[PDB]
Amino acid sequence: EFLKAGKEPGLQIWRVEKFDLVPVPTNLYGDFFTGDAYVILKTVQLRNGNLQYDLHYWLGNECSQDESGAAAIFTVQLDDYLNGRAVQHREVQGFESATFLGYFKSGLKYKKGGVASGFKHVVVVQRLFQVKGRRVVRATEVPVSWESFKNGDCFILDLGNNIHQWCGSNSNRYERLKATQVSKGIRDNERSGRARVHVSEEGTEPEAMLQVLGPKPALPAGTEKEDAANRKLAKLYKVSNGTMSVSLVADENPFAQGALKSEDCFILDHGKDGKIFVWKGKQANTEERKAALKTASDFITKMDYPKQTQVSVLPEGGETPLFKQFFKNWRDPDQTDGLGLSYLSSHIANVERVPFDAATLHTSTAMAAQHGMDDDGTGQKQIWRIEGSNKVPVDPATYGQFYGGDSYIILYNYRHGGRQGQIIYNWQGAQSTQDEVAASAILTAQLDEELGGTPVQSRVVQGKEPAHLMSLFGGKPMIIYKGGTSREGGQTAPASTRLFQVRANSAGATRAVEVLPKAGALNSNDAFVLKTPSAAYLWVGTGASEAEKTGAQELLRVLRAQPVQVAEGSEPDGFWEALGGKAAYRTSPRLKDKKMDAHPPRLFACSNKIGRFVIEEVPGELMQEDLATDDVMLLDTWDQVFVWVGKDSQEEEKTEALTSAKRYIETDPANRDRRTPITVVKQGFEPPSFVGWFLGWDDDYWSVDPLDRAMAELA
Ligand SMILES: [Cl-]
Ligand SMILES: [Cl-]
Ligand SMILES: [Cl-]
Ligand SMILES: [Cl-]
Ligand SMILES: [Cl-]
Ligand SMILES: [Cl-]
């Protein structure tokens, strides 16, 4: 007794019809009647072959309340049949989650009608659609009238055998490109290829358009997405009797993972940013868990949030990456073993995981993107130290050593594929004086412009160097001193006892970072170097590969001391108090390869609108076509925030590319490291570590205007 569901990886959509799940014809996936409710099941195949489920129910604007209730019931009971491991989403028309919208990049059509009105999914047609949206394109069915028209939008007059695409004079070219997807969708999916699509603009309306609409009058402009200030703060509550009562458990993110308890379920309030999460404990009694959706709705009312607020319901052990990022260092029991983690985001579920191999890196942009390496780091490079307001060439014998009282500029030529490119690294010491740091940024930008405005520009801060920057010095480790200086003047002497953290990247290169000499700075994944007046300790953590201890050894040579190698837990006590005694220090191993699972890359459009900084998430798989030439985009790799600069965006947004990327970082509710590197990228000159993230990158994509292409490519 059932309906054929669960199945294999794919997408299944039902329309809730008189308390019954009714399959939508697959060629109409994306069409929704505003008067009905739907249930949607996305099945994702994990890398280990297992199946992971996302259950969404979708409420139309004019949808019922009992019908909405049925959709809520079916979402709950389908999850019951899937043994409670799906994550549930309540999606309202016009404010659906990014995860939901990624299932349809032909757009969404919102149809007039519903079950009660007596309408089905199944030609004699006469509809009109208003198409709004850049990243998330939505086609709202509107009254067939000239009064529905706005000159800032594009409209689709559907006449069955003929489809008329009408684009207002005040509509930007990118919006017209997204509107062609809807017109093609109606042609290829509703009429299955047999329909003409006719494109036109203001003043070139065909006789058919004017025969149903009448003569065209003057038309008004259009009136109808994440302010950055609302992203940051969130709170965590514990529910009781979902007589619904909640108690504040944490008032400021990041939250302690220990705050979550298995016997209860919690609400993570992010409502000022438009979403709340319901985290179900695995030992919460089933009355509470089956009533999670009502508990979330009651919370929306109790806090006067908009009823369109996105609601997510997560089972314990299956929390999404966006949920876990609200927590200080979320660590699973499953973490270091296995193939993935609790969740695998739909938009990367089909990304082949390429291990690093320097010999073949020049042939795989995928490897470049996934490891943050544009090449093996063996090309021509000039290094400058900023003294006053000028670039001063650094002694080549000292290449790889960097002093915290300086800021440097690295010009590097990278080769990947059969193409050469340049990267300008702007390293800023944590103790470099503000004027020279600010001078290094200006001279960096100046160096870019004199080199054609084409080189990659990557702002780096001491202690958080990108993986590619470490690998620039042969087999020698990048050595990073705490607040010295290497200029001709004050060649000042070192401290008595120094400490050095020696970390390696996936390419084998290392960096030796001087840190405060205490036990709390130690780390079991890395080798360490402790130099005292007396001797020299070479400490090796239990997770330290041989590639780290070799790099730590070449550092003990430039320090001119012979080591005494000391394994973690096998420490002589002269070592133990040279730090001031023993204390706790980080031992949980790093994500290494699961970073992409725990922090998948995300694409955003940003904008410095008059007064407020706004970011819009780009849902679905990352596509080159999503990069509008008149936009400044952000590709949030975890270790590094790319900022792609469209060639046709305003000069204001172009020069603000650096700070807009940092306003994005500092407002991130994960409380991202403020030292996180930023990497400005120019349109048409993107590095492999950027393009390798994209399905189908065309090296000649922008040679022809994408809109001129689209009207040609069948329209
Ligand atoms: Cl059954
Ligand atoms: Cl069923
Ligand atoms: Cl949205
Ligand atoms: Cl990888
Ligand atoms: Cl290139
Ligand atoms: Cl990093």
Q: Walk across the sheet containing 154-159 and list its strands.
A: 31-33, 108-111, 138-142, 127-132, 154-159, 162-167, 196-201
Between CA 699 and CA 686 the distance in angstroms is 10
Task: Please enumerate in sequence order all residues whose Cβ is within 8 A of that of 66, keeping only pairs 6 or more positions apart, or say none.
Answer: none
What architecture (CATH level 2) is domain 590-715? 3-Layer(aba) Sandwich (3.40)
Query: In this structure, what token pair is assigned to residue 417?
Result: 């594929």
CA 676–ligand 6 middle distance (angstroms): 7
CATH tag, 1-122:
3.40.20.10
Q: Which residues are annotated as a binding site?
A: 35-36, 67, 79, 84, 86, 105-112, 115, 127-135, 152-153, 175, 263-264, 288, 405-406, 436, 448, 453, 455, 485, 525-526, 548, 630-631, 653
Tell me the C-alpha to C-alpha distance, in Å, between residue 667 and each of 357, 410, 514: 36, 29, 29
Task: Please enumerate in sequence order all residues whose Cβ is within 8 A of that of 352, keeping only pairs 6 or more positions apart, or say none.
Answer: 366
Percent composition of the chain: helix, strand, coil (DSSP 3-state, to 5): 25, 30, 45
User: What experiment produced this structure?
Assistant: X-ray
Alpha helices in 462-519 (DSSP H): 467-470
Q: Which run of H or of E encompasses 324?
A: helix 321-324
Produce one character per residue of 105-126: b if its CB has 16 or more CB atoms within 10 Å, e if not: bbbbbbbbbbbeeeeebeeeee
Between CA 581 and CA 205 the distance in angstroms is 82
Contact of 43 with 53, CB cutoff 8 Å: yes
Q: Which residues are annotated as a binding site for Ca(2+)?
A: 35-36, 67, 79, 84, 86, 115, 152-153, 175, 263-264, 288, 405-406, 436, 448, 453, 455, 485, 525-526, 548, 630-631, 653
Residue closest to 592 by CA, chosen among 371, 378, 388: 371
CA 83–ligand 1 middle distance (angstroms): 13
Q: Which run of H or of E encompasses 53?
A: strand 51-59
Residue closest to 511 by CA, chosen among 336, 375, 377, 329: 377
Contact of 106 with 30, CB cutoff 8 Å: yes
CA 5–ligand 2 middle distance (angstroms): 7
- End-to-end CA distance of the chain: give it in Å, rounded: 46
- Verify cis geometry, omega within 30 degrees of 0, for the bond prior to 393: no
CA 112–ligand 6 middle distance (angstroms): 50
Sign of CA dihedral 679, 685, 689, 695: positive
DSSP 263-297: TSEEEEEEGGGTEEEEEE-TTS-HHHHHTHHHHHH
Beta bridge partners of 151: none
Between CA 168 and CA 430 the distance in angstroms is 52
Sign of CA dihedral 208, 211, 216, 219: negative
Beta bridge partners of 416: 419
Query: In this structure, what token pair is assigned to residue 676?
Result: 């996180």
Contact of 348 with 313, CB cutoff 8 Å: no
Between CA 683 and CA 455 the distance in angstroms is 11
Between CA 376 and CA 359 the distance in angstroms is 8
Residue closest to 411 by CA, chosen among 466, 362, 469: 469
CA 460–ligand 6 middle distance (angstroms): 9
Taking ligand 4, which is a single-atom ion, which protein residues have CB atoms under 5 Å away? 353, 370
Contact of 669 with 325, CB cutoff 8 Å: yes
Between CA 563 and CA 539 the distance in angstroms is 9
The CB density around residue 649, as the number of other CB atoms within 10 Å, is 18
Phi, psi of 353 (to 5 degrees): -90, 110
Between CA 305 and CA 267 the distance in angstroms is 14
Tell me the C-alpha to C-alpha distance, in Å, between residue 229 and each of 271, 303, 336, 613: 13, 19, 35, 8
Between CA 187 and CA 162 the distance in angstroms is 9
- 359-362 contacts, C-beta under 8 A, 24 or more apart: 361/416, 362/415, 362/416, 362/417
Contact of 715 with 180, CB cutoff 8 Å: yes
Ligand nearest to the CA of residue 362, numbered in listed order? 5
Å resolution of this model? 2.7
CA 671–ligand 3 middle distance (angstroms): 23
Q: Walk across the sheet containing 527-531 and list its strands.
A: 401-403, 478-481, 510-515, 498-504, 527-531, 536-540, 563-567
Q: How many helices (H) and strands (E) does the chain have?
A: 17, 35
Task: Please enumerate in sequence order all residues whose Cβ is within 8 A of that of 520, keeping only pairs 6 or more positions apart, or say none.
Answer: 583, 584, 585
Between CA 206 and CA 200 the distance in angstroms is 8
Between CA 154 and CA 168 the distance in angstroms is 6
Contact of 374 with 423, CB cutoff 8 Å: yes
Contact of 588 with 550, CB cutoff 8 Å: no
Residue closest to 273 by CA, chosen among 619, 667, 687: 667
Q: Which run of H or of E encompasses 248?
A: strand 245-250
Between CA 306 and CA 309 the distance in angstroms is 6
Length of the chain: 715
Query: How large is the angle between the packed helices 66-81 and 292-302, nearest 10 degrees?
Result: 140
| Category of 90 on φ-ψ map: left (φ > 0), alpha (ψ -120 to 50) or beta | beta
Between CA 630 and CA 310 the distance in angstroms is 30
Contact of 521 with 585, CB cutoff 8 Å: yes
Angle ∠(458,463,466) on CA atoms, nearest 5: 35
Phi, psi of 156 (to 5 degrees): -125, 110
CA 286–ligand 6 middle distance (angstroms): 43
Q: What is the dihedral of CA 704, 705, 709, 712, to 10 degrees?
A: -100
| Strand runs labelled E in 370-418 | 381-387, 390-393, 401-403, 407-416
Sole residue written with tokens 């009312």: 301
Q: What is the three-class DSSP state of 518? A: coil
Between CA 190 and CA 129 the distance in angstroms is 15
3-state SS, 631-668, equals CEEEEEECCEEEEEECCCCCHHHHHCHHHHHHHHHHCC
Residue 634 has, within 13 A of its CA and on its CB side, a CA count of 26
DSSP 8-state symbol, 218? -
Between CA 221 and CA 224 the distance in angstroms is 10
CA 421–ligand 5 middle distance (angstroms): 5
CA 212–ligand 5 middle distance (angstroms): 52
Residue closest to 44 by CA, chosen among 12, 78, 10, 75: 10
Ligand nearest to the CA of residue 690, numbered in listed order? 5
Residue closest to 483 by CA, chosen among 507, 514, 508: 514
Residue closest to 28 by CA, chosen among 10, 15, 9: 15
Query: In this structure, what token pair is assigned to residue 581?
Result: 């005694």
CATH superfamily of 228-344: Severin (3.40.20.10)
Query: In this structure, what token pair is assigned to residue 38?
Result: 């739907």
Between CA 351 and CA 593 the distance in angstroms is 13
CATH superfamily of 345-493: Severin (3.40.20.10)
Contact of 444 with 409, CB cutoff 8 Å: yes
Between CA 363 and CA 140 the distance in angstroms is 45
Between CA 651 and CA 3 the distance in angstroms is 56
- Type of residue at 364: S
DSSP 111-155: ES--TTTT--------EEEEEE-SSS-EEEEE-SSGGG--TTSEE
CA 570–ligand 1 middle distance (angstroms): 59
Ligand nearest to the CA of residue 454, numbered in listed order? 5
Contact of 108 with 30, CB cutoff 8 Å: yes
Phi, psi of 311 (to 5 degrees): -125, 130
Ligand nearest to the CA of residue 2, numbered in listed order? 2
- Class of domain 494-589 as given by CATH: alpha beta
Q: Which run of H or of E encompasses 224?
A: none
Task: Please enumerate in sequence order all residues whose Cβ is within 8 A of that of 470, keeping only pairs 6 or more positions apart, or say none.
Answer: 377, 477, 478, 505, 509, 510, 511
Between CA 715 and CA 713 the distance in angstroms is 6
Query: In this structure, what token pair is assigned to residue 65?
Result: 């309340």
CATH 3.40.20.10 positions along the chain are: 1-122, 228-344, 345-493, 494-589, 590-715
Contact of 476 with 554, CB cutoff 8 Å: yes
CA 466–ligand 4 middle distance (angstroms): 15
- Type of residue at 112: K
Q: Which run of H or of E encompasses 580?
A: none
Beta bridge partners of 92: 59
Identify the burial level of 564 via C-beta atoms within 10 angstroms of its C-beta, where 0-12 means exposed, 13-18 middle and 19 or more buried. middle
- Type of residue at 708: D
CA 525–ligand 2 middle distance (angstroms): 48
Residue closest to 406 by CA, chosen among 473, 460, 472, 476: 460
